[PDB]
Amino acid sequence: GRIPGRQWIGKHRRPRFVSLRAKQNMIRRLEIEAENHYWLSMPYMTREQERGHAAVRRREAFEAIKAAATSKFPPHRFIADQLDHLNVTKKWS
Amino acid sequence: SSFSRAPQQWATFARIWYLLDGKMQPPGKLAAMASIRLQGLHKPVYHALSDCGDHVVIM
Amino acid sequence: GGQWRLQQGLAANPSGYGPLTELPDWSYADGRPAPPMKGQLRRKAERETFARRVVLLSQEMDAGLQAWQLRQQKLQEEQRKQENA
Amino acid sequence: NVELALTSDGRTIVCYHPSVDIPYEHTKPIPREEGPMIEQLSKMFFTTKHRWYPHGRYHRCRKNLNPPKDR
Amino acid sequence: GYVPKTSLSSPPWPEVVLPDPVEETRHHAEVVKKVNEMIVTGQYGRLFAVVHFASRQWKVTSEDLILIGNELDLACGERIRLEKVLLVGADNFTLLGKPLLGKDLVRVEATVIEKTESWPRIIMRFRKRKNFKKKRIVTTPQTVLRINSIEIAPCL
Amino acid sequence: LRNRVTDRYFRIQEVLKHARHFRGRKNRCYRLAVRTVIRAFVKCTKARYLKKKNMRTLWINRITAASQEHGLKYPALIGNLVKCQVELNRKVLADLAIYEPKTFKSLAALASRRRH
Amino acid sequence: TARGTPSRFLASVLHNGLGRYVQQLQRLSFSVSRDGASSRGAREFVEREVIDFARRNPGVVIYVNSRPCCVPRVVAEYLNGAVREESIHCKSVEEISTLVQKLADQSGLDVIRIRKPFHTDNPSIQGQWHPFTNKPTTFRGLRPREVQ
Amino acid sequence: KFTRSRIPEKVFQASPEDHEKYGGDPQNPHKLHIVTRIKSTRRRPYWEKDIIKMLGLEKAHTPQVHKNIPSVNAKLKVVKHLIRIKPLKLPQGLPAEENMSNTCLKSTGELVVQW
Ligand SMILES: [Mg+2]
């Protein structure tokens, strides 16, 4: 009793059957999403009320992004870092 | 408790003899009971490598 | 058995919020409290950020509603004020 | 044979489980060649023959002679 | 509603009757008092305790050694109190928290005996025919704690 | 031969020391040893998941045995302990089953009582 | 790997925590070079940290040789006789400090795989389970199907 | 072809039976969603992946607070099959600056200012 070809892809596939466990899992997901529908059905503000209520914060956030982007620049260089390399030959006298 | 080491180990890992009466019993259910006992899966000290199986006598 | 915990209002996972994870694991034998655990500190910081976001979003939405109310009031009062002759 | 009891506040469960002795009446008085060898040992210890055959030097030398001991 | 006695008339499991609450409370009080008296009189030898430390539950007794897989920020030889004790048990009685026993009941104390690194653990990633091969060696910090004593108090 | 490798001995030994306990030429010949040592290390890495998976299965088996000794089934024991707010984990429950049979008997009685 | 490596059980040296804690590290020997970039960090450690460590660990005898062999090293000898030798080659002061503190806090027992994260000499208080725990007895100890 | 799905508006019109079932009052609706990702974005369209990233639900089972406003609701409608939405309940009102560090989100969806 063999299934011609490769299983699960061809015209003739292994018969797959739905277990009670699979049905329960799907029903659980469906219930979660029905609740999602209910909770998405009651907007707090209308579209016209929300228009522009976050504009200031969004603009400040993008100002921060622009500042970070435009502040990119090579780091400082210190004489101390250069001179500290002389310590590789520090010894005890 | 308070046993010596060797007697304690002997008691813990001793193999017990069980009796099943197969009269009018389904062979599958008999076999489930017997297989559990033979493997030793009825013992909390069970481990696959401890050889903790028991004897089962089915009549 | 997480469904029962959820029904009783606890965390589904006992390793979530609860006494078993939020209380100090140990203390000095003298009684001095132990330094806060790293996970507890991280979790406190996360909860603080969550509360701060809650406050920010609520305040933004309330301010938006108040601003919309003021805009409606200004529109109606101005259209009334146009009646002057 | 266990007695369970919540405390008055209901925050700790107390289990009383004394050890029960065996009744005296529930006790009895004290009473007063390689092939064949492997078959005999297998029958004696309710094992198969395969356990009793020797192993090669390689396996024997692989075995650890000073295993760690706990407790 | 009477149903004649058949194989399926009643559930296979034996029917259970809830004991009358008055007698239940009386029995509960009696047992609690008896165990409290045992504690008062010191009618117990070794005590064991299930204690939640680090992220795990350890079955513990006096003089036991415990290997925590992380550094604790404690000097070696320093004494500590393990505060999340889930269970404390003796030969003849056990006390179960819901989920944790009170501080007044049980006092489990430990000592930082050792601070070590684990033996080198190998992390090897390999995928065939992809020239994908990676090797890493990781040593985890560890602390050995010795459980010094487990004390219970008659606070039931 | 301006630059020639002089450490190849030690580079080979680093691999071979991990293969010394293999069978056959895999413990001697670097060509064969290196392939098997890589497989050994990959197995060692992937075995950290199976160790945890098997310990829990071992704990569940031992708890099942111990609870069946008292007429309980493992699902009933675990669920009823949770409902009674006892947060003992399976490792500890198996340890109790083995070393504190009276405490485990108490827990099984508690679980059955809660069930009823 | 575990199968290709020795293993031991969790243990202390002499029940190190029961009565009192005894620091198992007893000797540190720092072989350091006067000259040589390899031992620059060791020199800084000897200058700035070895004295404070010594007075923090009065039970550890610390020797400083100022004349190494083949590399600057720290040899830690523990009470149980174990000797752990660690190269301090090209290590910074902080690296050497952490390494020395690790040696101080660590016991002489081998750093190999530890089979169990716990060690009880008295694993059972109520009696280790044996097949006859939880098994009821019968009148006169009669085995099943016994005639008398 | 496979395309974005337009959810008919009648899907998001609660009935009195739903109001009783779920315990939300259409008048005085809740202000904030608690959204958790309970489903992978793998094997889902790139637009659902992008919506999840926007909403900040990359980690599953990590609650995120969002405004209960029409635009956020549009995005949530797009990815409603990957998330669990519950109203954020504030029994003691929103936390004050004093107790901002002592809040905890109970599994019931309540932000309690004591922990
Ligand atoms: Mg085929």
Swiss-Prot record, chain B:
<protein>
    <recommendedName>
        <fullName>Large ribosomal subunit protein uL13m</fullName>
    </recommendedName>
</protein>
<comment type="subunit">
    <text>Component of the mitochondrial large ribosomal subunit (mt-LSU). Mature mammalian 55S mitochondrial ribosomes consist of a small (28S) and a large (39S) subunit. The 28S small subunit contains a 12S ribosomal RNA (12S mt-rRNA) and 30 different proteins. The 39S large subunit contains a 16S rRNA (16S mt-rRNA), a copy of mitochondrial valine transfer RNA (mt-tRNA(Val)), which plays an integral structural role, and 52 different proteins. Interacts with OXA1L.</text>
</comment>
<feature type="modified residue" description="N-acetylserine">
    <location>
        <position position="1"/>
    </location>
</feature>
<comment type="similarity">
    <text>Belongs to the universal ribosomal protein uL13 family.</text>
</comment>
From Swiss-Prot, chain C:
<dbReference type="GO" id="GO:0005739">
    <property type="term" value="C:mitochondrion"/>
</dbReference>
<comment type="similarity">
    <text>Belongs to the mitochondrion-specific ribosomal protein mL52 family.</text>
</comment>
<feature type="compositionally biased region" description="Basic and acidic residues">
    <location>
        <begin position="76"/>
        <end position="85"/>
    </location>
</feature>
<keyword id="KW-0809">Transit peptide</keyword>
<dbReference type="GO" id="GO:0005654">
    <property type="term" value="C:nucleoplasm"/>
</dbReference>
<dbReference type="GO" id="GO:0005743">
    <property type="term" value="C:mitochondrial inner membrane"/>
</dbReference>
<keyword id="KW-0689">Ribosomal protein</keyword>
<dbReference type="GO" id="GO:0005762">
    <property type="term" value="C:mitochondrial large ribosomal subunit"/>
</dbReference>
<dbReference type="GO" id="GO:0032543">
    <property type="term" value="P:mitochondrial translation"/>
</dbReference>
<keyword id="KW-0687">Ribonucleoprotein</keyword>
<dbReference type="GO" id="GO:0003735">
    <property type="term" value="F:structural constituent of ribosome"/>
</dbReference>
<dbReference type="GO" id="GO:0006412">
    <property type="term" value="P:translation"/>
</dbReference>
From Swiss-Prot, chain E:
<dbReference type="GO" id="GO:0005762">
    <property type="term" value="C:mitochondrial large ribosomal subunit"/>
</dbReference>
<comment type="subunit">
    <text>Component of the mitochondrial large ribosomal subunit (mt-LSU). Mature mammalian 55S mitochondrial ribosomes consist of a small (28S) and a large (39S) subunit. The 28S small subunit contains a 12S ribosomal RNA (12S mt-rRNA) and 30 different proteins. The 39S large subunit contains a 16S rRNA (16S mt-rRNA), a copy of mitochondrial valine transfer RNA (mt-tRNA(Val)), which plays an integral structural role, and 52 different proteins.</text>
</comment>
<keyword id="KW-0689">Ribosomal protein</keyword>
<comment type="similarity">
    <text>Belongs to the bacterial ribosomal protein bL21 family.</text>
</comment>
<dbReference type="GO" id="GO:0003735">
    <property type="term" value="F:structural constituent of ribosome"/>
</dbReference>
<keyword id="KW-0687">Ribonucleoprotein</keyword>
<dbReference type="GO" id="GO:0005739">
    <property type="term" value="C:mitochondrion"/>
</dbReference>
<keyword id="KW-0809">Transit peptide</keyword>
<dbReference type="GO" id="GO:0005743">
    <property type="term" value="C:mitochondrial inner membrane"/>
</dbReference>
<keyword id="KW-0496">Mitochondrion</keyword>
<dbReference type="GO" id="GO:0003723">
    <property type="term" value="F:RNA binding"/>
</dbReference>
<dbReference type="GO" id="GO:0032543">
    <property type="term" value="P:mitochondrial translation"/>
</dbReference>
Swiss-Prot record, chain F:
<dbReference type="GO" id="GO:0019843">
    <property type="term" value="F:rRNA binding"/>
</dbReference>
<keyword id="KW-0689">Ribosomal protein</keyword>
<dbReference type="GO" id="GO:0005761">
    <property type="term" value="C:mitochondrial ribosome"/>
</dbReference>
<keyword id="KW-0496">Mitochondrion</keyword>
<dbReference type="GO" id="GO:0005739">
    <property type="term" value="C:mitochondrion"/>
</dbReference>
<dbReference type="GO" id="GO:0005743">
    <property type="term" value="C:mitochondrial inner membrane"/>
</dbReference>
<dbReference type="GO" id="GO:0032543">
    <property type="term" value="P:mitochondrial translation"/>
</dbReference>
<dbReference type="GO" id="GO:0003735">
    <property type="term" value="F:structural constituent of ribosome"/>
</dbReference>
<dbReference type="GO" id="GO:0005762">
    <property type="term" value="C:mitochondrial large ribosomal subunit"/>
</dbReference>
<comment type="subunit">
    <text>Component of the mitochondrial large ribosomal subunit (mt-LSU). Mature mammalian 55S mitochondrial ribosomes consist of a small (28S) and a large (39S) subunit. The 28S small subunit contains a 12S ribosomal RNA (12S mt-rRNA) and 30 different proteins. The 39S large subunit contains a 16S rRNA (16S mt-rRNA), a copy of mitochondrial valine transfer RNA (mt-tRNA(Val)), which plays an integral structural role, and 52 different proteins. Interacts with OXA1L.</text>
</comment>
<comment type="similarity">
    <text>Belongs to the bacterial ribosomal protein bL20 family.</text>
</comment>
<keyword id="KW-0687">Ribonucleoprotein</keyword>
